């Protein structure tokens, strides 16, 4: 029928750790901020979050909900559960078109839409993601309690992961024909106490048992993969933001002020070069939010 027009100083696309941290700075600067969030955090798979001082061991859902409530306590902050499908530069800033068909208008944008894990094509793996199969050992290595750990090989980068893993438990480097250690490497692994298993993996079964092509089964307490990741949205590219290749996938380029190559568009969290954890998302999200405010004031 009818509705009143709205205009936001900043719209934050993505409302998990990075976006909430950014939006909070803007809310505290008494500007109008909207978070549009599609409700699918990268960390929606594990039961606990670790490594963020003050939130260590808490449920990711509870951390997200507390942050949302704290932000929405500010009357100048608003939230929409929706997905931005198209971002357009306008004379008056930016227009966002969402999957619902709703449109929103902003002077500036903060991108905080996260990455999506692209898991190896291995039967049983995806079903155990965040339960017995993980990406980052600082996040989940401690809780393995010195047990048996499998490093699912995925190329050269898995070598360093294998070398690091004995900090947390008895490590087996399952190369899965993705990598063959040279002389130096084979010797460094042996010295580190890492066992190398070269046979192809057929599937993961039960909680965390690796079934090899030759029929062998090896039970693990946890498995790690250095998997690829992709940007969760084409919005950065739509806005003309420069995107660069990192070791494990693309990131949105940002400067010291978390600003992308497109003036007035900032980025934070996992989609930036130095993200990858909640602590970093909170930190650089705060930087992006303050930077976005400062541009509203000083251009």
Ligand X SMILES: Cc1cc2nc3c(=O)[nH]c(=O)nc-3n(C[C@H](O)[C@H](O)[C@H](O)COP(=O)(O)OP(=O)(O)OC[C@H]3O[C@@H](n4cnc5c(N)ncnc54)[C@H](O)[C@@H]3O)c2cc1C
| In the complex, minimum distance from the CB of residue 285 to Mg ion, in angstroms, rounded to a whole number | 13
Task: Tell me if 136 contacts Cl ion by CB under 5 A.
Answer: yes
Task: Tell me if 297 contacts a copy of itself by CB under 8 A.
Answer: yes
What track of x and - describes contact with ligand X for positions 214 through 253 (by CB under 6 A)? ------------------xx-x------------------
Task: Tell me if 118 contacts a copy of itself by CB under 8 A.
Answer: no
| Contact partner, 294, from a copy of itself, ligand X, Cl ion, none, Cβ < 5-8 Å per class | a copy of itself
Sequence-ordered alpha helix ranges (H) in 183-233: 183-192
Q: Which of 41, 50, 128, 228 binds a copy of itself (CB under 8 A)?
A: 50
- In the region spanning residues 135 to 154, those forming contacts with a copy of itself, defined by CB under 8 A, are 137-138, 141-142, 146
The SS3 call for residue 244 is: strand
Sequence-ordered alpha helix ranges (H) in 82-238: 137-140, 157-164, 183-192, 235-238
- In the region spanning residues 101 to 120, those forming contacts with ligand X, defined by CB under 6 A, are 112-114, 117
Stretch of 88-96, 175-183, 231-239, 279-287 contacting a copy of itself, by CB under 8 A? 279-287
How far apart are alpha carbons 49 and 140 in whole angstroms?
9
- In the region spanning residues 1 to 40, those forming contacts with ligand X, defined by CB under 6 A, are 13-19, 36-40
DSSP helix, strand, coil percent of the chain (3-state; round to 5): 30, 30, 40
Q: Give Cβ neighbours of residue 70 (< 8 Å, ≥ 6 apart).
A: 20, 24
Sequence-ordered alpha helix ranges (H) in the chain: 17-28, 60-72, 137-140, 157-164, 183-192, 235-238, 278-298
* Residue number, 137 or 153, with CB nearest to a copy of itself: 137
| Contact partner, 56, from Mg ion, ligand X, Cl ion, none, Cβ < 5-8 Å per class | Mg ion
How far apart are alpha carbons 154 and 225 in whole angstroms?
7
| Contact partner, 46, from Cl ion, a copy of itself, ligand X, none, Cβ < 5-8 Å per class | ligand X
Inter-residue contact 106 to 34 (CB < 8 Å): yes
Angle between helices 17-28 and 278-298 (to 10 degrees): 30
Which residues lie near Cl ion (CB under 5 A)?
134-136, 139
């Amino acid at each position: 029928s009818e509705t009143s027009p709205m205009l936001f100083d900043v719209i934050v696309i993505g409302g998990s750790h990075a976006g909430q941290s950014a939006a909070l700075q803007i809310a505290r600067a008494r500007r109008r901020v909207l978070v549009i969030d599609a409700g699918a955090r990268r960390n929606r798979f594990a039961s606990q979050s670790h490594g963020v001082i003050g939130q260590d061991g808490r449920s990711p859902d509870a951390i997200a909900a507390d942050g949302k409530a704290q932000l929405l306590a500010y009357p100048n902050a608003q939230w929409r559960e929706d997905s931005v499908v198209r971002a357009e530069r306008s004379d008056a800033g930016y227009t966002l078109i969402c999957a619902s068909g709703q449109h929103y208008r902003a002077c500036q944008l903060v991108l905080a839409f996260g990455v999506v894990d692209e898991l190896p094509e291995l039967e049983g793996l995806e079903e155990r993601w965040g339960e017995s199969v993980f990406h980052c050992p600082y996040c989940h290595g401690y809780e393995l309690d010195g047990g048996r750990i499998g490093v699912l090989g995925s190329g050269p980068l898995s070598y360093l992961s294998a070398m690091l893993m004995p900090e947390w438990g008895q490590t087996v480097f399952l190369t899965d024909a993705s990598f063959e250690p040279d002389e130096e490497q084979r010797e460094a692994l042996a010295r580190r106490g890492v066992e190398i298993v070269r046979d192809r993996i057929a599937r993961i079964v039960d909680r965390a048992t690796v079934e090899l092509a030759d029929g062998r089964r090896i039970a693990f307490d946890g498995l790690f993969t250095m998997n690829r990741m992709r940007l969760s949205s084409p919005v950065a590219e739509q806005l003309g933001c420069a995107i660069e290749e990192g070791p494990l996938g693309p990131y949105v380029r940002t400067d010291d002020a978390m600003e992308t190559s497109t003036p007035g568009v900032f980025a934070c969290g996992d989609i930036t070069h130095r993200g990858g954890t909640v602590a970093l998302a909170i930190g650089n999200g705060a930087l992006a939010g303050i930077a976005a405010h400062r541009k509203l004031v000083f251009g």
